[PDB]
Structure 1
Amino acid sequence: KLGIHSNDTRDAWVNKIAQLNTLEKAAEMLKQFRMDHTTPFRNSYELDNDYLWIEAKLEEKVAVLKARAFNEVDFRHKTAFGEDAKSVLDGTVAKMNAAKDKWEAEKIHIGFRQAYKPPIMPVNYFLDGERQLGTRLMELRNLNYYDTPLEELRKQRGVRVVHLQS
């Protein structure tokens, strides 16, 4: 079974997700999944064709579990890991505003997403974070955007140049 919308990989993860019955275990698995399968900094590209869908299914479980475990105040203001959302948001923004360059900035923004994307951090704080972190990242990235030659930009990004044609 190797379909686009339905396949063995997806089935296997649905089974794996069905066994996460406590918030801490489920939230931890979601964060681990994001480190392992999302963004260009992911640990591997093995789940490239299904990770987006699988991540959503894992999110669903963490969400329902969090709503059942947290009281109303905590559901609004705490992360799934019990951290104070505002503190995390403010702390991350602080680091972002201190970032020395666009390279440090991209790591901060991307890492923040992998770690706190809802249902880990409440949506309100998370999108407020997107608003602030994204602004700085762009301000740093878009300054003198074309000054660096591609020959050198390839080195800065750290890609392995496999083939070139002209």
Structure 2
Amino acid sequence: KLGIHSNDTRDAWVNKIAQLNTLEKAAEMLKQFRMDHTTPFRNSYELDNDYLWIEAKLEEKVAVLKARAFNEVDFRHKTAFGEDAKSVLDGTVAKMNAAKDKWEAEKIHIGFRQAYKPPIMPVNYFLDGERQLGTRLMELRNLNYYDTPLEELRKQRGVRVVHLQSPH
């Protein structure tokens, strides 16, 4: 049974998340799920057409379990893993402001999202890091944006050029 909004691979993951009954297992499965299927650095592109929807159905389970487990002060200040939100936040920003180049800066930001995107980290700290990390990322990238010729830029990105065609 194929489909855009309803398909076998999605029904597969719903029964899989339904088996989760521990913020520990749930949180971990979301963390790993993001490592394997999101961002241009994903471990594979096999779930490309459903990962977005599945991730959310996974965030829900984690969020609920996190509410039934954490207390008021924790749900507001600690990650689903136990980490202290502000700690992580302040540490990541330090690494970012220390980043020597855009290549280093981009890895810090992307990795931050795959690891702490809610319901892992509290939204307030998460979006707070989003404004700081993103600011540092753009500042490094947009500096002399066009200096590097495409030929060299492709080598920097490390892309595998499969075909080039240009009449002009």
TM-score range, shorter chain: over 0.9
TM-score normalised according to structure 2 size: 0.99
Cα distance, 1:119 vs. partner?
Answer: 0.2
**Hey, what's the Cα distance between the residues in 2 that align with 1:100 and 1:42?**
24
- Cα distance per residue 1:23-52 (max 9 Å; x no partner): 000000000000000000000000000000
The 2-side partners of 1:94 and 1:15 are apart by 40
Question: For the residues of structure 1 that align with 2:17 and 2:129, how far apart are their CA atoms?
Answer: 28
Q: Which secondary structure does the structure 1 equivalent of 2:161 belong to?
A: strand
TM-score (norm 1): 1.00
Aligned mates of 2:18, 2:133 — CA distance in 1: 34
Q: Distance in 1 between matches of 2:20 and 2:135?
A: 36
Q: Give the drift of 1:76.
A: 0.1
- For 1:146 and 1:2, locate their aligned partners in 2 and report how far apart those are by CA, in whole Å: 44
CA offset at residue 127 of structure 1? 0.1
In 2, the alpha carbon distance for the partners of 1:57 and 1:148 equals 41
1:125 Cα offset (Å) = 0.1
Q: Secondary structure at the match of 2:162?
A: strand
In structure 1, the residue matched to 2:91 is 91
State the shift of 1:150 in Å. Answer: 0.1
Separation of aligned partners in 2, 1:19 and 1:125: 29
**Cα-to-partner distance string for 1:83-141 (whole Å, 9 max, x where unaligned):** 00000000000000000000000000000000000000000000000000000000000
Structure 2, unmatched stretches of 5+, are: none
Q: Any idea what SS the aligned residue of 1:164 has?
A: strand
Q: Distance in 2 between matches of 1:63 and 1:78?
A: 13
CA distance in 1, matches of 2:34, 2:46: 13
Number of corresponding residues: 166
Percent identical: 100
Q: Which residue of 2 aligns with 1:30?
A: 30
Alignment RMSD (CA, Å): 0.2
4+ residue runs of structure 1 moved beyond 3 angstroms? none
User: Residues of 1 paired with 2:3 and 2:31: CA distance?
Assistant: 26
User: Which residue of the partner structure matches residue 80 of structure 1?
Assistant: 80
